[PDB]
Amino acid sequence: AQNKADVISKCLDDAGIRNVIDTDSSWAQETVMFQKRLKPDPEAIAFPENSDEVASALKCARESKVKANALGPAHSFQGNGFGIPGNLVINMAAFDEVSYDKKSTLLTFGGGTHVGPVQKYLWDTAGRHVPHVRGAHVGVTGSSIGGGFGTTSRYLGTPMDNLVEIQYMLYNGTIVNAKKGSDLFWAAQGAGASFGIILSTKTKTFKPQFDKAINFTLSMGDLTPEAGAKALVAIQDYSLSKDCPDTWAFRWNIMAPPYDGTGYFYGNPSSFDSVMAPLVKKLKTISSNTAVKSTVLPWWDLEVAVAGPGMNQPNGGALGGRSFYTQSLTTTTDHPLTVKQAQILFEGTTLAFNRTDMTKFGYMDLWGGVSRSIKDSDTAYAHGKNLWLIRWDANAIGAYPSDGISYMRASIKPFEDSLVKGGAKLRGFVNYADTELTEKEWSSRLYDGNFERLKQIKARYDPEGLFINHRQSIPLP
Ligand SMILES: *Cc1cc2c(cc1C)nc1c(=O)[nH]c(=O)nc-1n2C[C@H](O)[C@H](O)[C@H](O)COP(=O)(O)OP(=O)(O)OC[C@H]1O[C@@H](n2cnc3c(N)ncnc32)[C@H](O)[C@@H]1O
Ligand SMILES: *[C@@H]1O[C@H](CO)[C@@H](O[C@@H]2O[C@H](CO)[C@@H](O)[C@H](O)[C@H]2NC(C)=O)[C@H](O)[C@H]1NC(C)=O
Ligand SMILES: *[C@@H]1O[C@H](CO)[C@@H](O)[C@H](O)[C@H]1NC(C)=O
Ligand SMILES: *[C@@H]1O[C@H](CO)[C@@H](O)[C@H](O)[C@H]1NC(C)=O
Ligand SMILES: [Cl-]
């Protein structure tokens, strides 16, 4: 109905809740998101100042038979900040509180907070850290319910795994604290938007063991495709050996030629060269152009380098954005990559890429480390024993080309086939969800054998399906 907006806006007006609809003059300014390939088209946007107003917005959505959709800082690569067109979007910006409990060492952050100010408050107040995504403007809540693997996650774990309590407002306005060990908390670790509006969240915190830490580059230049594949398999072997500490981090670009990457080291700075020596020795046997450059930085200066100048600003900086389409696969330590699989990946993606209307953007992050003690059943998003996080992407120079998606999906299909051929099952990463997958595909790749349990929790907490608000929302059984 094309007067649905009118009934909703009058419902919200009567509840004292600031809101806009597409006849408001600020509609354009309030419908902005990071992903430019998709166009936001909510039915209305509410701006609750407190939990009572969130409850009143939920009732309004139910009364007009529309879905409810939380809007954080708008970073979703899938457009989920606004969701499927026709939602009542609930803008969470007022929920910006952050507080630290120095007795428990738990940090509490509101449902609309950004990474930068949460980290800076914790660092300035207590000299402590919480693993986080590589963008100070990103929503802490949104990024944490979708995984959030960051540079410190090989030794400190992921943002999602370090949560301990989530304060939910459910579809009927009831507030509940979901604690670690419960079904609602388990479901929120991978599918949090499907169960309610998150008002605040508590997380573990950590003390860095050294004042300074290291950012490095590793470069091997222009290699043959076979030599590039050997190099990746050698990096993998090092990462699985006794020579690689969990305080290491490394991102291997999928941009070749050239072959190179960027990494970090969070152990004792003077140990760096001995940590890297076994890796460099092996890579030198593949190419003499192997070269490592490194810098020692104070803890916070390195954090600003990783996640941007917004780390120092009260809203975490600027949104930015471009037009792109993300694909992403994860693999585990039960299926280390072969030289053939590494070559097929690069041959089909970055080495074949020949568009002049898009610019390729690919990389694979070394996971591993403390993922070794995680089981796929421990959290809704199955990531036990993850070893690689692979992202293959491309951003449009202008508008996104009509054949871009089919071109990009065909690029990496041979690699997917090769993973299956060697006996792996295809897996994904929620924050890098692939908008083009069927339900059978994304449910298998994100939730594998947790999916049936996830749907039973969904019926318990959202029987009306009010929060079935994006393409990969958990359905009712
Ligand atoms: C823009 C961006 C994203 C990003 C990144 C760097 C930048 C510049 N770096 C990342 C990284 O290093 N690692 C990673 O895993 N992801 C990274 N991202 C992606 C980002 O984490 C995800 O896109 C994330 O979903 C963004 O969340 P944010 O909250 O900022 O964005 P949103 O579009 O408005 O909302 C995303 C989804 O989460 C739900 N949500 C958000 N807040 C709530 C609350 N309070 N309650 C319930 N659900 C909530 C939204 O409904 C939507 O589904
Ligand atoms: C590690 O990160 C630092 C901080 O960003 C990099 O230092 C910058 O280096 C460029 C030139 O390479 C200068 O123009 C910047 O002014 C530097 N910034 C600071 C704060 O010093 C450093 O190059 C990185 N080290 C690597 C990649 O090995
Ligand atoms: C670009 O790549 C596509 C995909 O294989 C191919 O069909 C096309 O001929 C290529 N164009 C050029 C100029 O190489
Ligand atoms: C609100 O919904 C939850 C979700 O099932 C339910 O447990 C609770 O009883 C409901 N509360 C009220 C007051 O209806
Ligand atoms: Cl030091």
Author numbering: 23 to 499
Quote from the publication:
Here, we report phylogenetic analyses, combined with the selection and characterisation of five fungal AA7s, three of which belong to previously unexplored clades. We determined the crystal structures of FgChi7B and FgCelDH7C at resolutions of 2.4 and 1.6 Å, respectively. Both enzymes share the canonical AA7 fold comprising an FAD-binding F domain and a substrate-binding S domain that is formed by a central β-sheet flanked by α-helices. Moreover, the two enzymes share an aromatic cluster comprising: (i) the catalytic base tyrosine (FgCelDH7C Y454), (ii) a tyrosine/phenylalanine (FgCelDH7C F99) that stacks onto and stabilises the catalytic base, and (iii) an aromatic residue that stacks mainly onto the saccharide unit penultimate to the reducing end (FgCelDH7C F383).
By contrast, FgCelDH7C acted as a dehydrogenase with a preference for cellooligosaccharides with kcat values of 32–42 s−1 and the highest catalytic efficiency on cellotriose. By contrast, the structure of FgCelDH7C revealed a unique active site architecture, as compared to all hitherto available AA7 structures. The first notable overall structural difference is that a loop (residues Q335-F346) that flanks the active site in FgCelDH7C appears shorter due to a preceding helical segment that folds away from the active site, which provides a less occluded and more solvent-exposed FAD-cofactor compared to FgChi7B and all hitherto reported AA7 structures. By contrast, FgCelDH7C is mono-covalently histidyl-tethered due to the substitution of the FAD-tethering cysteine to a glycine. A third structural signature of FgCelDH7C, compared to all available AA7 structures, is the substitution of a histidine residue facing the isoalloxazine ring in the FAD-binding domain to a serine (S165). A fourth different motif in FgCelDH7C entails four arginine residues that protrude into the substrate-binding pocket, providing a distinctively positive charged milieu compared to other structurally characterised AA7s.
